[PDB]
Design a protein around this ligand. Sequence first.
Ligand SMILES: Nc1ncnc2c1c(-c1ccc(C(=O)Nc3cc(C4CC4)ccn3)cc1)nn2[C@@H]1CCCN(C(=O)C2CC2)C1
Length: 260
Amino acid sequence: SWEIDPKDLTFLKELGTGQFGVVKYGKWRGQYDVAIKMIREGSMSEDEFIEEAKVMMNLSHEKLVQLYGVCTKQRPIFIITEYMANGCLLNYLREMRHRFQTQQLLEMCKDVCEAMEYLESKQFLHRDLAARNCLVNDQGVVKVSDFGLSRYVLDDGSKFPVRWSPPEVLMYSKFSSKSDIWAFGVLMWEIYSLGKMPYERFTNSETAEHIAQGLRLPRPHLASERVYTIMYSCWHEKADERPSFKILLSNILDVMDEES
Ligand SMILES: Nc1ncnc2c1c(-c1ccc(C(=O)Nc3cc(C4CC4)ccn3)cc1)nn2[C@@H]1CCCN(C(=O)C2CC2)C1
């Protein structure tokens, strides 16, 4: 299967602490550069996680973080992925030294929209889409990661992911691809806001109340009326009125072509 021999891994440097444990940079078989995420003990429903992991291993798309294998015959569990040099997109946006161009911001939205259109086509829900869960490689390409892992988190008022959730999730936990749509719109807002906190002046519970009342994030300065109309369309009250990732990608492609 997708089992990797942990004895063929080398830990050269700890890149930081992510969701479900620490992440290392090392070599696989002394040939390939990889990132090894060590699942912290007691942070996930490991049995359910290992099975579904095999399903996620078969998901293949350029804009999804490439999964190489796992190390489940031991503890802590190891996840071997490709090394994204520029790390977390959120910290990447909050790096003013990069001086992102508007065209680059739209390119980052398209990268994420490609992966979500693929996940949508396979009927796989991410359920925690946000800049913090996206990664960037040396070439500046954004890729989606941690898709579908919140299902196996072990919880140990309103929590932080409320700021990326539509009303039906806040009130009923009715997760669907349409709730990924909403979250993607907030992701576009983070991008064009260069990592700004959504609803920065509000607590989690207050954000939930304002969302249920119809409050929407404002138009970022770096976003044109055309771009803001796309991210704003992810925020229709009725889940069935929100466009699919097919339409979102189609819209983003149209704007990019006009800017060509
Ligand atoms: N690959 C990287 N390359 C460079 N850095 C990386 C990573 C990662 C990483 C590694 C693996 C995974 C994973 O398991 N995804 C997955 C698995 C499955 C498996 C069930 C089948 C299913 C879906 N997604 C997710 C993130 N994390 N990190 C830094 C961590 C610390 C914070 N970071 C920062 O940048 C801030 C310091 C600035 C990023």
